[PDB]
């Protein structure tokens, strides 16, 4: 499911998501999954 992880101990997850997702707004840290809409 996940496009990557998110690691709490990155303090920019929720950036990295969003750039696996293919943008700003993009991609969801939900718990440890990065999941794009």
């Known amino acids: 499911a996940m ?3 998110c ?3 990155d303090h ?3 950036r990295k998501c969003d750039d696996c997702c293919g943008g ?4 969801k840290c939900k718990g440890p999954q990065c999941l794009c809409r």
């Open 12 to 14: 920019q997850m929720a």
């Open 3 to 5: 496009c990557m992880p």
């Open 7 to 9: 690691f709490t101990t």
């Open 24 to 27: 700003k707004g993009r991609g």
